[PDB]
Design a protein around this ligand. Structure first.
Ligand SMILES: NS(=O)(=O)c1ccc(Nc2nc(OCC3CCCCC3)c3nc[nH]c3n2)cc1
Length: 290
């Protein structure tokens, strides 16, 4: 990484620092991830990402491995969904844009998911935007690759806000639907301008889900009561109408979000099926101002 000149700290990820950086030889502008430990499977895992190429997936440019330290070099985008959400909070993000972004992330998930790759940690901060109206997923596949801790190397708390219930209930094996749950929460959040489930511990996170969606049981979620962290003592909350959860959203939109938020990971709509949902009948791609 003597072939890069650091330009600035873009932020602390799970895995370490991400820098905006400039290739001193090639002139190219990049994001550089330092990864904190390296280990064999991780290198093989990274190296499959190199080939997982999609317009809605931030490109993995190169993997550099020297002096036992690890660096990931990605295409660079100029803004993330959060700063855009902040920027645009007085009036909210126009619904046509919300729809465009949802549709492109869905296209993204459909791609990775059909190759078996999960994100496992989607959030406004890894959703990245550009001036041409594109939105792209960042850090695909890095969770299986490295692991996830509680505190980042900088003991910033990793957020729970987008985590799927089956994860919090301790299922050791999850599928792609965990990303659908996350994207669902991010959708609601775009629509309303406030995180759907801002939990600040695992039980607070689980109990906020429960309060909005009803405490899961064997009727809505076969098999639920016998998952590791399920306690028959959970307070027994009633399910709220979605007209109340995401008010301004129209029917096709409340209908999609619903199926992305199904309790049973098995019944949860896949990316592929979401893409075909009536909500996208009128989908376009506007340019965000920026
Ligand atoms: N706050 S912000 O709007 O000022 C802004 C944000 C991100 C970027 N650019 C950018 N950022 C990344 O990681 C940001 C990421 C670090 C790890 C966890 C989530 C946050 C990238 N990873 C690949 N490519 C990347 N490109 C430009 C401006």
């Amino acid at each position: 990484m003597e072939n890069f000149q650091k330009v600035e700290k873009i932020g602390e990820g799970t895995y370490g620092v991400v820098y905006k950086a400039r290739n001193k030889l090639t002139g190219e502008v990049v994001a550089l991830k330092k990864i904190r430990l390296v280990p064999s499977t991780a290198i093989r895992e990274i190296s499959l990402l190199k080939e997982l190429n999609h317009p809605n997936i931030v490109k993995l440019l190169d993997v550099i491995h020297t002096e036992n330290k690890l660096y990931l070099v990605f295409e660079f985008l100029h803004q993330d969904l959060k700063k855009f959400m902040d920027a645009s909070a007085l009036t909210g993000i126009p619904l046509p844009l919300i729809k465009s972004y949802l549709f492109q992330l869905l296209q993204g998930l459909a791609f990775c998911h059909s190759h078996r790759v999960l994100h496992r940690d989607l959030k406004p901060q890894n959703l990245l935007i550009n001036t041409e109206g594109a939105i792209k997923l960042a850090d695909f596949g890095l969770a299986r690759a490295f692991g996830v801790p509680v505190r980042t190397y900088t003991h910033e708390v990793v957020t729970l806000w987008y985590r799927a219930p089956e994860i919090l209930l301790g299922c050791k094996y999850y599928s792609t639907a965990v990303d659908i749950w996350s994207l669902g929460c991010i959708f609601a959040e775009m629509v309303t301008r406030r995180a759907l489930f801002p939990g600040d511990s695992e039980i607070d996170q689980l109990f906020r889900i429960f309060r909005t969606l009803g405490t899961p049981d064997e009727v809505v979620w076969p098999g639920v009561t016998s998952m590791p962290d399920y306690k028959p003592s959970f307070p027994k909350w009633a399910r709220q109408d979605f007209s109340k959860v995401v008010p301004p959203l129209d029917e096709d939109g409340r209908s999609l979000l619903s199926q992305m938020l199904h309790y049973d990971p098995n019944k949860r709509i896949s990316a592929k099926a979401a893409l075909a949902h009536p909500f996208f009948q009128d989908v376009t791609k506007p340019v965000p101002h920026l």
